[PDB]
Design brief:
The structure is cut from a larger assembly and holds five copies of chain A.
Chain A: E1 4-17, E2 26-32, H1 39-45, E3 50-60, E4 71-77, H2 87-92, E5 97-100, E6 105-107, E7 131-136, E8 144-157
Antiparallel strand pairs in A: 1-8, 2-7, 3-6, 3-8, 4-5, 4-7
The structure holds calcium ion (5 copies).
One calcium ion binds next to loops of chain A.
PDB class: virus
Keywords: nervous necrosis virus, Dragon Grouper, Cryo-EM structure, virus
Entry title: Cryo-EM structure of Dragon Grouper nervous necrosis virion at pH6.5 (3.12A)
C-alpha cells in the first residue's frame, strides 16, 4: 500500500541546567513529541498526511562531572494537553524513571497506537502521541548538560506534500 | 494488557424542583456525561487517560407523591457540543422517554464506542459520549426530588495520574 | 483523434438524483395548556392542518421534493393531567383541509374519531388520501394536505389540563426538486 | 528493512515559450532527472542516501490553442553526462515522441534500475537515471505554456539527513 | 470524417531502433619495435587501456550506443623476432583501469598472465567484468573500460624485437543512442 515504515534516533532536546538551580520540580526538558522535533521524521512528515507511532523509547543521556550530587526523573505523558509538571504525574505514567545525574536511563512509555496527523492543528491530541517531561529531583552541585535522545518507529500513510 | 473493565450504578444528578416552578421547557438536569460526574468512575479516570463506554443505561427515580401533577421527559444527545435544550432535540433522539413525575423510566441511549479521553480538551467530542437532558413537561404541583442513576460499564487504558 | 473547432460536452450524470425516500418518524404537532374552567363545550383545543411544514423533520425533506404521498398516518392524544379531573375530550381527523366546521358531531361523523375523559389517552387511526400530494403550497390546499386534526373539550374541565398531540407520519417523497420558500 | 517505496506525479518543469521565439532546435526543457527536481521525491531524498528508479514515465501537457502552429519533440537520454541537445539524440533514443503543440504525449524511456545516490558527486552517472530534453520542432505561432509531469516510482534506502 | 481545427499527428514508429548487436572481431591494439639492448627489466613495452575507441571497428559501433558489455575478451601476444634472441616478456591484464603500477609482480598476480621467451607466442585469457559499461568517457574511467593490458620485458633483449598485441573482443552493445565525440 502507501504505508512506509521508518525508524531512527533523534535528539529532541538538549539543555544546560546551571549549577545550583536544580531545585525539585523544576522542568528541564518539557517537549511535545510532534514530527517536527525529529529531523528525519520532520522531513518524512512533509511528504505524508497521517502517521502512527509503532514504537517510541526515550533515552536520558546526562553529561556531568562525577561530583554532581543531583538526580532526575523522566516520563512521557500520553496527553499533549496535560500541563501538570509534578513528580507524581510523571511517576504514575508507564516507563517513568528516576536516576542520578551520572546514569543514563531508558523510558519505555505506553504510546497510543492510533493513526494521528502529521500536520499541526487546533487539537493536539490528534497530532502528538504525547509529551516528555524531565524534572531535576535533587539539587546539582555542577552544571549538567542533559540530552534526551528518542527512538521512534512511525508508519506514515496517505501520501501528500505539505508546508511548514 | 491495560484493559481495566469497570461497571456499576452511580447517581449523576440529584435535583430538587420546587413546587409551582415547573414551567414547560424548564431544564432540570443538563449534564455532560464525563467520567468525573460518576463517583466511582471519577476516581477510576483520575488514574487513567483513555476510556471507552461499553454499556450506558440511565434510569430515573423521582421521589414524588403518586398524586402529583406533571411529567418529565429525558433524552441523551450523542453530541456533547449541542446546546439545544428543547423538547425537539429529545423527541428527535433515540431512546428518549416521557412519563409522569412518579414513574421510573430507563433512557437506553445511542452512544459512541470509540476511545475517548478522561481529561478536558478544546472539543468535548473526544472527552464525553454525549449529554443527558431532563425537561419538565407540564407544570409540577408538589415538590419534585429527581435522581438520575447511571448504569455505566467502561474500559479504561493508558495508566496515568491526573489532577482535576 | 483530430482537433475539432469545439469539442463536445461530456456532462453525463446530470439530473439523475434519487426519486424515492421513505422518510418516517413521530413528532408533536400541538401542545396546549387549558386553564381550569375554560374547557367549555365546543372550545377548540387543537386545530392543526397536517402539512409537511407542520412536521419539523418532514419540512426540510419536502423542501427538496415536489410530491409526497402519506403512506401511514396515526395520532396519539396524550393528556398529562391527573386522574381527578372531570370533563371529556374528542379528537378527530377531517379529511378536507378547507372544512372549517368545529362541532362535536362533525368529528364524531368521521372514521377513527375518539371520545374519552381527560385522564385517559387515545389513538386516532384516521382515513386519509393515499394519492400523491404536492409538497409546496398553492391556490387550493386540497392538493397539499391530507386533512386537519381537531381536538375539542366535550365537557367543562375542572383542573388545568396539559394535552399533547403526537403524530406518527410515514410519507414517500418523490419527483426530486429544490423547492424554495 | 529500509525499502521505502514511493510513487506519484510531479511537474519537473513549467516553461513559457514566447510567441515567435520558436526557432528550430531551440531547447525548451533540458533537465537532469535528480530527485531534487521532483517536489515530493525531493523531500523524500533529503532524508535518504540511495534511491533506485522502478517506474519512470514522463507526460507532457502543453496548454496551447488548438490552432497554434508548431510542434514539440521529447526524449530521455539515459546518460546524464551527454550534452548533445539536438534532434539527432532524441530521434536516436528509445521512447522519444514528436507531436503538435496542442497534443499530450507520454515519453516512456529506457532508464537504469541500479541503486543511485541522492546527492551530488564528481560524476552524474551514479546520481541520476538520465536527462530529459524537449525541443521546439518548427516555429511557434502563439505563446506556449508547456508542463512536463513525471510519473515516478522509486525505492529509497540508507536513511540519512542531507542538506542541499 | 469531419474537418477538425488541427489533425492529430501520425508519427508511429519513432524511437524504436534495435537495442542489441553482438559485434565481434579481432584487432591489433599495439605494435612495438624494441631496439636491441633497450629491453631492460621493467621497461613497459605495451600499456594499453581497453576502450571502445582503441578498438577500431568497435569505436564507430559504440558511437551509436550508450552501454556495452564485454562478453568475450582474449589477447594473443605474437612476437616476430627470430629464435636466436635472448630475454623474456610478461603479459597481463589488470582489471582496474585506474591502476598505474607497472611491475612484474603486479602482472604475475593477476589471473591469466603469461611469461615467455621472446621467440614464443602466448595467449592471455584474462578475468574481466561482465557488467554493462558505458561507451562514452566520464569522470571515472572504471565505468568505461574493463581493464588495461600491460606487456613488459622480463629480461634484457639481445636483438631487435617486433612484438604485436592482438585482441579478440566480443561485445554486446545496447541502449541505442547517437553519442558524439
Ligand atoms: Ca495536514
Ligand atoms: Ca489527559
Ligand atoms: Ca412545488
Ligand atoms: Ca550523500
Ligand atoms: Ca554516453
Amino acid at each position: 500500500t502507501n504505508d512506509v515504515h521508518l525508524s531512527g534516533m533523534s535528539r529532541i532536546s538538549q539543555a544546560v541546567l546551571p549549577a545550583g538551580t536544580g531545585t525539585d520540580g523544576y522542568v528541564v526538558v518539557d517537549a511535545t513529541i510532534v514530527p517536527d522535533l525529529l529531523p528525519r521524521l520532520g522531513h518524512a512528515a512533509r511528504i505524508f498526511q497521517r502517521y502512527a507511532v509503532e514504537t517510541l523509547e526515550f533515552e536520558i543521556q546526562p553529561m556531568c562531572p562525577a561530583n554532581t550530587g543531583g538526580g532526575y526523573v523522566a516520563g512521557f505523558l500520553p496527553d499533549p494537553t496535560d500541563n501538570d509538571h509534578t513528580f507524581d504525574a510523571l511517576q504514575a505514567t508507564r516507563g517513568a524513571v528516576v536516576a542520578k545525574w551520572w546514569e543514563s536511563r531508558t523510558v519505555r512509555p505506553q504510546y497510543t497506537r492510533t493513526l494521528l496527523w502529521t500536520s499541526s492543528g487546533k487539537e493536539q491530541r490528534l497530532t502528538s502521541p504525547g509529551r516528555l517531561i524531565l524534572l531535576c529531583v535533587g539539587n546539582n552541585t555542577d552544571v549538567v548538560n542533559v540530552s534526551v535522545l528518542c527512538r521512534w518507529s512511525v508508519r506514515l500513510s496517505v501520501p501528500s506534500l505539505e508546508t511548514p
